[PDB]
Amino acid sequence: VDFHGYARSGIGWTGSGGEQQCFQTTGAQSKYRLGNECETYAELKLGQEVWKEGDKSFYFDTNVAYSVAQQNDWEATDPAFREANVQGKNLIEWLPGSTIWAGKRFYQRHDVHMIDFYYWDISGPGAGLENIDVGFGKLSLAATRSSEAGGSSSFASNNIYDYTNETANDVFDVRLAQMEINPGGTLELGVDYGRANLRDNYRLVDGASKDGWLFTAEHTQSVLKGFNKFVVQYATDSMTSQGKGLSQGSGVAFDNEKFAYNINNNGHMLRILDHGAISMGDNWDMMYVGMYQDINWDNDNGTKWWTVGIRPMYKWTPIMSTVMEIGYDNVESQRTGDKNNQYKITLAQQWQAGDSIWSRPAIRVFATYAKWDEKWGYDYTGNADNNANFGKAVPADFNGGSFGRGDSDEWTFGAQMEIWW
Amino acid sequence: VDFHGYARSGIGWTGSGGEQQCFQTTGAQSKYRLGNECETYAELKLGQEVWKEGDKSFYFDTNVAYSVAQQNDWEATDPAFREANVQGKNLIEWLPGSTIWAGKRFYQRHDVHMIDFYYWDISGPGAGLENIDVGFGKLSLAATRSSEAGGSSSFASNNIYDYTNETANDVFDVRLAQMEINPGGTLELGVDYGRANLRDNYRLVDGASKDGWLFTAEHTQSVLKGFNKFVVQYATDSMTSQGKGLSQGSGVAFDNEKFAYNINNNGHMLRILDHGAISMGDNWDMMYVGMYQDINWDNDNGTKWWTVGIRPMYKWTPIMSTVMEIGYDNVESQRTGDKNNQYKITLAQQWQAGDSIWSRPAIRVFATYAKWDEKWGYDYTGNADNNANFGKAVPADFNGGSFGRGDSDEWTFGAQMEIWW
Amino acid sequence: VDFHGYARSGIGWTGSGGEQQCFQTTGAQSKYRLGNECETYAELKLGQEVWKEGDKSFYFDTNVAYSVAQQNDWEATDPAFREANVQGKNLIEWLPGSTIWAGKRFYQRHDVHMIDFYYWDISGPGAGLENIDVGFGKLSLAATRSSEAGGSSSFASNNIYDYTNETANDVFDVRLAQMEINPGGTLELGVDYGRANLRDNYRLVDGASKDGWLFTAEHTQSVLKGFNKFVVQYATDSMTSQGKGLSQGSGVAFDNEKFAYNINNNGHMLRILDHGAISMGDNWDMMYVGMYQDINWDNDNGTKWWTVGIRPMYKWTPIMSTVMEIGYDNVESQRTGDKNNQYKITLAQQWQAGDSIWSRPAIRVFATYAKWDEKWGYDYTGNADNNANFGKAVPADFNGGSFGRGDSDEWTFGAQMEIWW
């Protein structure tokens, strides 16, 4: 039994009073993590190599994930059961070093750690054949699934409230990885294709996106005792909404009161992303991100997002460091052309296992200052039946309402544990 | 710390579209399971030998069970807390070999693996004295509890809806096991007795069954590198409805909208079951089942079930095999005399941790075909207050409605992992 | 990976019929717990020392807790994510022997085992610095959080029902432990200060306690192969209601229908407690408790509690003992001056892992007798909206109702396990 995982927990305060506020720009899909995580998250993996004969082996792996509010000792919660898979390694005699796998799995996820952002991720129930040698790189193929909570009807209608039956979406990939291009630099290329999957006689809404494509190209360059990753992704239609490689094809979303409304995913997403971590001399490590994400949809409800962040670390002695994180977001509405923006400055003293920017457990004591200006938000006034602008981007002062977090600053402070193992 | 358990997970499709359909005959209590499990299910057990001195020890064991629908990554669910027991070996000097135990435990469950069917199983919160030597065999004695969600009233009434207080049931066993009866064959005999248990002044409905008996005789014969188990079980009254060891004595069941309704369970069950697994030379194995089950109740709502299945395995290499499963169900209604019937043909290719038909993990790729014809179903139209036929077996065409899955066929295909460790 | 925890589970009966009932005096905050636990409870901790260099290390710890009814095998439940923290030992250069920590944690909890009563407990989300050596003793410092489910309003109002927003409470610890004092004795002194913490513009109800103090002094004396603990605690205002070190500054509670009601906790608590465990020879051990707790509130709804209990254990042979527990509770109502009382006598035969009264795993077979006499209870008739006496102590016969459990007596029996590892 092999024990691995990730956990974060802590205690924080807000300068105006109360418990810790979390700062995320309205219309942005992520937040600069340092001193800006307001939840206790823990995911626990119990694995084992359960059989081995020479080079051939079977590995078993699980994951149970807990999310709680960090407000009380006794916090009851639904645990999320996220993995349960068997991996058969080097087991197909005419394909050396391949892994055959089936079950529920985190499958080759790619993230930007300082903003907590998975940019490519098709994790789920699935099966596949991974790490096929083609003599110049590695080829991996899987089939995986997600579902939309409704969006399908058992009869043809023009009323959206009939479309309440669950919609399975299947994703099929090809990943071609580890291609040597330049000395010290590698290329990874992926194509993910997704589609809604319907039982016979079942029907999606008219104009539903229904299927869609995602194309990923990543260059990874070894540099300065660390690396630079440069990522370009293009996606169409049913892959736009998630924007990570899981498909949503119905175009239907659900209210709290269980009314159904249209969110239609036709159009395209362009993502251009640079990130990495480097060491400068021996006393400084620095982690960084720059991203442009453009979502263009035929219903005009898309967003255009710029994110720029740097995280320099200074090392005083091997186990003790000072970390600063400076980030700036700009989010433009397609619908109105207005702009929401935020900058966050976090300064923290950190004790950690080993001397690296990546090495953890880490114990942090921090102070965060955040200044935002938001001039548009999403209309969620009333409910979907009541409101024709439900789920749509609108100005801050729209119709005498208040949308977005307006213009204000705030500052938070506290202490945090973070570990992976 | 000792890590043991069971898990199954996968991904599948249906030939007419959508996610994997699961095929079970209306009125049958089990399903032929190769390529016909649609659930991600895992049981995770953490044990330890906490104290050991000489021949004596205290073993501690737990079980946490997760069931999710295998449609997304983030699947939140209630975990079922199924075990937490302490087992004390050789602590009674004058009963050597014996185990005393108390707490929540899976106590000596007996199943047929290819249909996922427990035929003897009194598992629950309990306590007992296990594996006493009587010189010619082994004797084990326990007491366990189950409950029924209502069925008890605190006052004298003739109204069914007043019987909403929970009904505790006590189960007490005598298991006399491992007796040599012929060369290479052993006999096990069981008597399980159970009753409803009421708080003072409380009561069940007039004509409630209240208490009941289960009598089990099992012969285990070693043949052809495996075994044949031949099982005869007779049960009466409160034991009939649950059908495998736990008393249900109230006779009252509950609607979705929380209307109580009288089912009753007076009468008898006869189960005759033959099953096992054998090896037919080096390259061939087979597991097999034949079962007759007769449930006869004074309210006419019983069922008469015939089921028969075979599962040949062919070995190509020590770790790669082809599995065929052929199963047939026929279920006759006591109430109408009509018959529901289904046959299933599944062909699968699998990779497995060693040569044996019992070797796990196994990673499968499968294709399943199922043909059914159903002429009776259970009436669940409306609710118990507005429908007098609620929970009763009715013809397929009853009132011009549709009951049971009619006359149809379908096929499914996919990939699956099955593991115990 | 290190696997540790606590668990208890069993099966029992009541002499008048049914499952096992649990006996606790109306207005008492604990129950004499040998043969008087009706819950399957398990806490499962997975720890690991994940980095070690010289004296220094980082230790990671977890706790997930399950509490289920012990009525069936399949008991679904919300697990409580109680704890998840990292502890950095010997990291700080000029504070040798000190530990820094952050996350959800069980922090310095002191209990009386025979009544299951934590008398000092500030556990929760937090962070701290502990075991700072000051040469004559050790200093420990922490900050932890607890949160009330409502009690805060975002606008100015005199309406109690407008106070529905959560109220964060922050607790600040100073513990000075391990003082030399006398041959074979030692002393710990603690001061905990707690306060409600509000988001800007928000408010609590008029006259709400808002902040408060706990003052703890504990002397521990080594005596007769075991120990005595003598505890004096005094608390004021917001610390009184929880009574163990977590402030509740709102003064607001909620009924099932979600009507807010005022339970104001201004005033003071005095607790005097004596407990311990000793060996009176080779074959005789005993555990004991005596306590006086007086809660005096300005709304007259406090309670005045006397309790005393002894638990002698006779050892026949090293693994088998006979345990008796005799306890007496008396609770006086501040509001009425009436008295509720109970005496419980439990006799049990125990097998346990070793020859100490603290040795567990333990398997117990028991019989418990209890008589109670109750002259007052709490009014929970109707809702907080329609009953002006809601949540308040009233005579047993109030308006011809029945409040408290009257005069009665009963006996329970069965078997249970209790383990820690």
Author numbering:
A (entry chain C), B (entry chain A), C (entry chain B): 1 to 421
Pull verbatim passages from the article behind this deposition.
In this work, we set out to determine the applicability of GROMACS density-guided simulations to automatically refine a membrane protein system. Using adaptive force density-guided simulations as implemented in the GROMACS molecular dynamics package, we show how automated model refinement of a membrane protein is achieved without the need to manually tune the fitting force ad hoc. The proposed protocol was used to refine models into a new cryo-EM density of the membrane protein maltoporin, either in a lipid bilayer or detergent micelle, and we found that results do not substantially differ from fitting in solution. Fitted structures satisfied classical model-quality metrics and improved the quality and the model-to-map correlation of the x-ray starting structure. Fitting performed well in detergent, lipids, or solution, offering simpler options for fully automated simulation protocols. We also present selection criteria to choose the best-fit model that balances stereochemistry and goodness of fit. Additionally, the density-guided fitting in combination with generalized orientation-dependent all-atom potential was used to correct the pixel-size estimation of the experimental cryo-EM density map. In addition to identifying a robust parameter set and model-quality metrics for refinement of membrane proteins, we report an improved estimation of the pixel size of cryo-EM data based on goodness of fit and stereochemistry of simulated models.
